[PDB]
Amino acid sequence: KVNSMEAYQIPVRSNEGSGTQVFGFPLQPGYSSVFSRTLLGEILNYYTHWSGSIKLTFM
Amino acid sequence: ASDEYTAGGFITCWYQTNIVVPADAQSSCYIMCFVSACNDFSVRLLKDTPFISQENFFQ
Amino acid sequence: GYSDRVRSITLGNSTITTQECANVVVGYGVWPDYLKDSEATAEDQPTQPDVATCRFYTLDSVQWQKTSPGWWWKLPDALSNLGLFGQNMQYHYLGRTGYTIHVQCNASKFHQGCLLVVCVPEAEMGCATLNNTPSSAELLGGDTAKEFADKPVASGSNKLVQRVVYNAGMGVGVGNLTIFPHQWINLRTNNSATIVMPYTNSVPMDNMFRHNNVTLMVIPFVPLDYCPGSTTYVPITVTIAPMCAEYNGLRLAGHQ
Amino acid sequence: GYSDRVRSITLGNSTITTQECANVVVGYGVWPDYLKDSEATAEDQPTQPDVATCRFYTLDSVQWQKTSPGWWWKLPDALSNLGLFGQNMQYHYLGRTGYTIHVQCNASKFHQGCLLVVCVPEAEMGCATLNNTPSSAELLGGDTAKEFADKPVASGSNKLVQRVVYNAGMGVGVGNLTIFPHQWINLRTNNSATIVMPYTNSVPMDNMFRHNNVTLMVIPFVPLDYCPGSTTYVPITVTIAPMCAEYNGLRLAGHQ
Amino acid sequence: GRVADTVGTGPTNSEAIPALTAAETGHTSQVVPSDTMQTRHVKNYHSRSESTIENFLCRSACVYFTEYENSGAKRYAEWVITPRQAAQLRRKLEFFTYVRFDLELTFVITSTQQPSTTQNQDAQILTHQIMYVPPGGPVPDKVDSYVWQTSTNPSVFWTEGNAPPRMSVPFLSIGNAYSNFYDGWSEFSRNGVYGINTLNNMGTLYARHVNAGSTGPIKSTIRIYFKPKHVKAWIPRPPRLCQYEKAKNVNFQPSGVTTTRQSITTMTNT
Amino acid sequence: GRVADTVGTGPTNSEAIPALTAAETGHTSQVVPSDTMQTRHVKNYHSRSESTIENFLCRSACVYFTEYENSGAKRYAEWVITPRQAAQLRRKLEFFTYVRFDLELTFVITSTQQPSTTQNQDAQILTHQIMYVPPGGPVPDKVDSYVWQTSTNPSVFWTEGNAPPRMSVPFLSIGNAYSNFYDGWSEFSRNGVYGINTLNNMGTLYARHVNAGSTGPIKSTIRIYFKPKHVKAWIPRPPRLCQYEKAKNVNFQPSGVTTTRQSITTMTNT
Amino acid sequence: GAQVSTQKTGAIHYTNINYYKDAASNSANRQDFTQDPSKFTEPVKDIMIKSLPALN
Amino acid sequence: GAQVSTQKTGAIHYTNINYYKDAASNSANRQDFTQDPSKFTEPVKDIMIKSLPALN
Ligand SMILES: CCCCCCCCCCCCCCCC(=O)O
Numbered sequence A: 001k002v003n004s005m006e007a008y009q010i011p012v013r014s015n016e017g018s019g020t021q022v023f024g025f026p027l028q029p030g031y032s033s034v035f036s037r038t039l040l041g042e043i044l045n046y047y048t049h050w051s052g053s054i055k056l057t058f059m
Numbered sequence B: 001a002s003d004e005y006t007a008g009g010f011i012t013c014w015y016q017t018n019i020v021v022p023a024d025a026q027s028s029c030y031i032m033c034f035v036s037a038c039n040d041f042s043v044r045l046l047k048d049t050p051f052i053s054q055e056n057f058f059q
Numbered sequence C, D: 001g002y003s004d005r006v007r008s009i010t011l012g013n014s015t016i017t018t019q020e021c022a023n024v025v026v027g028y029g030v031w032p033d034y035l036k037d038s039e040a041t042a043e044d045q046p047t048q049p050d051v052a053t054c055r056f057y058t059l060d061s062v063q064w065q066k067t068s069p070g071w072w073w074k075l076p077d078a079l080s081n082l083g084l085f086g087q088n089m090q091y092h093y094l095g096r097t098g099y100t101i102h103v104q105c106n107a108s109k110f111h112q113g114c115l116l117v118v119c120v121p122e123a124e125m126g127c128a129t130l131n132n133t134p135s136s137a138e139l140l141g142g143d144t145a146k147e148f149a150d151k152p153v154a155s156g157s158n159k160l161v162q163r164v165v166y167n168a169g170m171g172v173g174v175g176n177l178t179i180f181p182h183q184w185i186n187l188r189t190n191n192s193a194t195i196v197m198p199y200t201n202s203v204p205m206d207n208m209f210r211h212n213n214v215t216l217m218v219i220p221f222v223p224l225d226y227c228p229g230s231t232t233y234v235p236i237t238v239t240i241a242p243m244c245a246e247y248n249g250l251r252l253a254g255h256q
Numbered sequence E, F: 001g002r003v004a005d006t007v008g009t010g011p012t013n014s015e016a017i018p019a020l021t022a023a024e025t026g027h028t029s030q031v032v033p034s035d036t037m038q039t040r041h042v043k044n045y046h047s048r049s050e051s052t053i054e055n056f057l058c059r060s061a062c063v064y065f066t067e068y069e070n071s072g073a074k075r076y077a078e079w080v081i082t083p084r085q086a087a088q089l090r091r092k093l094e095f096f097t098y099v100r101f102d103l104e105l106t107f108v109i110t111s112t113q114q115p116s117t118t119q120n121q122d123a124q125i126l127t128h129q130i131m132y133v134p135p136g137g138p139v140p141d142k143v144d145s146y147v148w149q150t151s152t153n154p155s156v157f158w159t160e161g162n163a164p165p166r167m168s169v170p171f172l173s174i175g176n177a178y179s180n181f182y183d184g185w186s187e188f189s190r191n192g193v194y195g196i197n198t199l200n201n202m203g204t205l206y207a208r209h210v211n212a213g214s215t216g217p218i219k220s221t222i223r224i225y226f227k228p229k230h231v232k233a234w235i236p237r238p239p240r241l242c243q244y245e246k247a248k249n250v251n252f253q254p255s256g257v258t259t260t261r262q263s264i265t266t267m268t269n270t
Numbered sequence G, H: 001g002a003q004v005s006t007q008k009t010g011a012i013h014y015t016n017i018n019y020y021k022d023a024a025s026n027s028a029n030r031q032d033f034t035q036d037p038s039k040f041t042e043p044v045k046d047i048m049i050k051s052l053p054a055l056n
């Protein structure tokens, strides 16, 4: 699916029971494949060290 | 860069309460995610980026 | 600009945001707090874990069905297996606490229903047979919701509790429970409800395992009614936050 | 009394009122304007048609389907056949302009969807084959929307542009396009979106036919999903208003 | 320049909702970590210095190199000036639509013997010449052609064993800045060359040996290094994704968005 | 800075007892030689300067060297940066648990011919390149690989016959100081690599010839030299005893406490 | 006609002089720290407040 | 913006100037003599007096 638009979409479906996991990914903004090609991902790869607070906005 | 010493953490998303949908409304939804750096963010030690490749000079 | 429908609560790490709700019923009007030194008894210095304790927990969500009678939890022992508040419970002879209960059940605009969230200090349940008393296993369960039973419980020689809803297990009128603090989850205009309970008890501090001083009850009055084709499964979820915990008399590990 | 959902824009004759929208993203923070005399070059006195130019135009509305990849327009040449702004484009060697883009797609509460309105200064599209370059006919069309293609374009000897969405034709990550100004049309909480673009270019003025400096893109991220029985055909419509136009160097009629 | 402080916060119960917003406005929320949790007062002495544009674009980089010999077919090397014939520099300039800066050139020249049967080869110190030819100027077709006199054109004489030569150049563009991306044709008929190739005429750069230097053949290597200074930038944009192909145009080969991994839950890369 | 004075003293008879104390308190007695005997007033102009940390740790030292050739299998040399691959420097830093300082690098490069039958060998001036690669960066697997362009990574071009090159580096550690000794694993399961090897990721250092330089084979030698500056230290400790074995860990071979001698009374070493 | 400025430290002065007649010969300026995020974040006409709901 | 200090003698001034913009480029500081043995010798809570018995 990385060759389609669906790479950016998170499926959410009505289940019959509660507590199922929607998704998860490690936090390694310069290494992990998730953030790798993101905007923040690119700028980091030029730099070795970083610190701060990453916001995650969901819609 | 990836190292086990400083490894960042984890992130998850769990159903708090199952999606409730009326009749005639679509069952499945989608959720898009965003990333940004707060105003305390900082970086250091510029380097090369492994992503971009090359073979011989472009023409 | 502002709205009364929306609320945001923050304790320690956790945070709970709700875009549809009502105000927050506070106790009898006493905002929870620490212990003033006028009423103190224990002469050891109390532990105040603060952020380690104060925060929100989420128990097991329980399904809600057309025939579902209701549910009850016992707060002093529910959390006992969760987090440091479960650990700091086992290692102390005394504790003092107050609870913020937050119940979350949402539905679309096409789902009828009404719930009742009451928080009952010292609910004392009867027994199936008249002579015996309930067993410690029946009144409680770890993090799990115990539920009522819609029709009378046949009385054998067992220790079972009396689960009839209309008596609410305490042998009172269920219609009268609103003297205690409460709120109405109503699928029409609401989504979630909230309660803040200060510390209520006869003595200034208490042991946690012996005496369960606060009971939580969710009783549907108007069952869930919806036309076919809409989603069937609507869970209810409860969130329970201790506030201003204190502890005394550190001892060895266990309860026995 | 007031509301943030509602907005009314008036330029010249035309007016656009919307009862559901968000705020108006303004450029990079520079409200468009005329040319100060410090940076001027052309020594002829500029024409300022004002109301004759500044006003809203409406291009051809384009259907939006479950599989529809997306669309792009080129602003400097779109309007070229419409109104005096099309006429005043052909008779001058120079122009300076800024754009207010207003995109309108509405749906009922039962229609899922999300759109992305970005306005990309100097979008330079590649070619199908690696050696050639796109033809002037493929990158453009009069008032008509050119659309992407969801799957890779087979590379022959043609001049066709590379229409894959996930590369967005510029060979970048489509997920990153938000650095440019943008807004989200979302069938949930929105109806229409709005952008204001000041004049961006390397040199203070420019020829209009040669250099298309501003590209508009609408890319659906979450396709249209709706249960049967609801209306099928949902169009998208674009509205484009020049602002503070100027012109220099009157010449004969044509482009060649 | 310094990072902002994170201000402490106690508990909160209130109708003000920092944790909520609407991204549909195209507005990145300013929320700071003190809003959604409890926070202790902390002073940060971290500095944003090394993230400034100047330190980002200013490093020497090898754009290109050639080979020219002491005898035979190719006796000199000619190159038109574009940054885009080297991958890793071109990418660093594609963040910014409009860039402005003053080049600082540095050349690095080396010599290499070539296999031959010539007898009694005895070296002498070679001397390299490097001539710049602004556009439209005369173009030498042979090493001894008169153009090498350099009555005007800036030229540099260099010698092996000395330090590498260096010269600085000011801002040469016609407009108010260089342009990395240009959408349009060179001809009012929308025909001819498309893309940024039309804007770029920088002239040409040449090099030659001054003297034969020995009897045996010798091949030389020259290397150019840009070092932008005084940089200013405008209108940032997404970094490039697909590998480069040609130096005259943005043409690319379609490639996936990212790398892949196993099922969404999986916490490790593959 | 100066030595303290020794104050004179006459005879003494008194119940105050300087000469006695209890070492069980872990308290080194401050007694000065004037207490247990008679002493004349003496001014000392001796200075403790050369015993300061700065003069102790600051001297250039040869940590390591490699060999890379002009042709054949090995055309470049790669080395990860650790001080511990050289005995006498590593020991000087093992007094102090936590050290802080700013390296000053200096390279010394030499060339050597190799025996061959190649005819008409005629040298030219070689040019060495030295490239630093902070961690995680791209790793060249071949001399002509694109990575050598050094669009960013700090790199040095050097020439034979000139002075040895030098560059200074600031404090690169993440924490508040380098750590010489680290007790713990890299993994929360107490598994994997044990010891200081986990803390140390400094990146990698590379070198190559720029040009072949002649027909005949040539082998080169590079040498690195640290010169700590601005030093600060904490928590001193006992010097190391047994000979070193590995560079990744403190492993040692058991050896006696000291050398020996004859019967306790014997006044001379053996 | 010298000038004095401050180095980059963490927990001093250096003397620089321009020797040439052309601006492009002067050394790079590494020290300009001025930053105003408002030109990318918050590009809206109506100023929005953190403490309030976005769409009221 | 020079500076003046004293050499190391026994029985004079030198003029130094920092030419670079980075602290790590400045010359080593050889002259800091500050010494306080109390952090290794005498690490006790109750201050002990030389002239008195240790354990009384
Ligand atoms: C010996 C004198 C040598 C002079 C070197 C002149 C080199 C000119 C550099 C132009 C810089 C980068 C510009 C890209 C041009 C464009 O695409 O518009």
Ligand SMILES: CCCCCCCCCCCCCCCC(=O)O
Pocket: F081, F082, F083, F103, F105, F130, F131, F132, F154, F155, F156, F169, F172, F178, F179, F180, F196, F199, F200, F201, F202, F205
């Ligand atoms: C050409 C640029 C060369 C740069 C040289 C960088 C060398 C880094 C030196 C690190 C120093 C001593 C550190 C030991 C590390 C550890 O064990 O934590």
